[PDB]
Structures are given as structure tokens and as C-alpha cells.
């Protein structure tokens, strides 16, 4: 079986720590169960079917976008801050997912990813569930939580 749990945890933690440079992105307790706000979705294709989903509240989304662009964004409803917020978070998703599938030439398959999707002002993105789910919360210095989820399709 494709052993993705460790590769996933390593990719998620590794990328966040390398991109957001704020001392202490703490890995929470991985759990089978869950998380409005925003959500980034990167589909996993090829031999495995699934997806990588990153969710956080609006405040956290602005905080993260602010740190990554080295400039303050405090109005997610501003028409161009919203543009950069979306583009920044989806790119974080793209990098986590890419590094993840890359550490997979540890298997005799092929693991592809799709362009990312940004779902904000969302319904607690019901991306429902009938396949291996794993939610991993990462805490930023303040109360801000970024949850990285991977659902492979057994």
C-alpha cells in the first residue's frame, strides 16, 4: 500500500515552516475528525484519487497572506487584497501538494495534482467523506489554526 501518512505530515509541516517565517508553527494532534472561512483544494490524480484541503478562518487567511507578501492585509473584502489572499493561499496548497506527491517517487506509480481551487465565504466546505481522511491542525503563535487535510480514495 501507498504509505502517504508520513510523507504528508512531512510535506505539510516542512512547507509551512519554510514559507511562513514565524517562530513556531506547531503540529497539533492528527485526527480522523475535523475542522465558514476559506479553503484551498488541490486534487490528487493518477493512481491514487483524493485531495489535499487547507482551511482556516478569514482572520488567519489575512494573517498568512500578510506574512507571505510582507505587507499588511486587513480587509479581505477589498477587491484586490482578496485577489492576492486567494492567490497566495492556493499557492501554499500547490506547494504542499507538489512536495507531497514528489516524495512519492518512493512508489512505482505516478501521482499527479490539479490546479488549485479557492473556496471562501464558504459553507464549511462540506467536501464530504467516504475515504481515508486525516486532518492535521497547525497552530500559529497566536490562536490561529491552519488545518491541512488529506483524503485518499482507498
Amino acid at each position: 500500500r501507498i504509505d502517504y501518512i508520513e510523507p504528508f505530515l512531512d510535506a505539510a509541516s516542512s512547507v509551512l515552516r519554510d514559507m511562513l517565517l514565524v517562530e513556531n508553527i506547531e503540529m497539533g494532534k492528527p485526527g480522523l475528525k475535523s475542522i465558514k472561512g476559506v479553503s484551498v483544494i488541490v486534487g490528487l490524480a493518477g493512481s491514487v484519487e483524493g485531495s489535499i484541503i487547507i482551511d482556516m478562518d478569514i482572520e488567519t487567511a489575512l494573517f498568512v497572506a500578510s506574512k507571505l507578501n510582507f505587507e499588511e492585509y486587513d480587509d479581505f473584502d477589498d477587491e484586490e487584497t482578496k485577489e492576492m489572499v486567494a492567490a497566495t493561499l492556493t499557492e501554499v496548497g500547490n506547494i504542499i501538494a507538489g512536495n507531497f506527491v514528489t516524495t512519492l517517487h518512493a512508489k512505482g506509480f505516478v501521482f499527479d495534482i490539479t490546479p488549485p481551487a479557492f473556496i471562501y465565504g464558504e459553507n464549511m466546505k462540506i467536501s464530504n467523506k467516504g475515504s481515508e481522511a486525516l486532518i492535521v491542525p497547525f497552530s500559529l503563535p497566536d490562536g490561529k489554526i491552519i488545518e491541512v487535510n488529506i483524503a485518499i480514495r482507498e
Binding site: 519554510d18 507578501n69 485577489e83 497566495t88 500547490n94 501538494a97 507538489g98 512536495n99 506527491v101 514528489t102
Partner: protein, 134 residues
Amino acid sequence: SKPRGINYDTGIPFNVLIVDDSVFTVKQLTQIFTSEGFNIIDTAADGEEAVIKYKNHYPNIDIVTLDITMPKMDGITCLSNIMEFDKNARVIMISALGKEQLVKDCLIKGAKTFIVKPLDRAKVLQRVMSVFVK
């Protein structure tokens, strides 16, 4: 210190075409290149737009940075298309995907070098100038 983005045979900045579906990444690369003296001749958010713009500026593009995962047209398909149009094109792949064989396949298809994300100014710059030897 001789900004690297300047062609010292004319004093004119080298032209860079940035291709990535993320405006965040386009902005990061833009800062990196301009701070070093390069001129961003144009940018594209997908492989189709990249091909059009590359042909539009063609003789004048000195280097192309190319992402892989993108809507409408991915960077691997884009790479082959640009190399088909212009055998002398200089493309550097810059992507979140880094499987080692993918790297070799892009080089085989014509890319000069490859850069794995997340980005840092220093690395990008060192890679960009290696495709500048004679």
C-alpha cells in the same frame, strides 16, 4: 556591484517572461528579477497565454521562467510548444513538482535548468545566471 540583469554589451536590461498561474508567485519573481536589474517584458497566467506572448515578443525574450501546474495549459506542454517554435529559447522550470525524472524529462524537452519551490531570491538568481555562460 554589476547588477546581473544588465546585458553589459549594450547596457540594456535582459528581458524576462514570467509564467505561473499564481499572481503571488508572479509578484515574487517580478521583485527578484527587477531588484537585480532585469526587465519583465511580460507575464502569463497559463500555458496558452504564455505561447501567445512568447511568439509576440520572440526575438526579444532572453529568458523564460515556467511553472508546471496550470489551468488551460500545463508547463510541460508549454515547454514543448515554445521549444518547437524557437529552438534557441531559454526556459527555466520553476515548480512545486520536483520528482527527479520529471526534471530530466524537462531538460530532455529543452529546458535549461529547474528550480523547486518554495523560492528564495538567492537561489533563483544563481540558477538564472548559470544559463548565461558562453
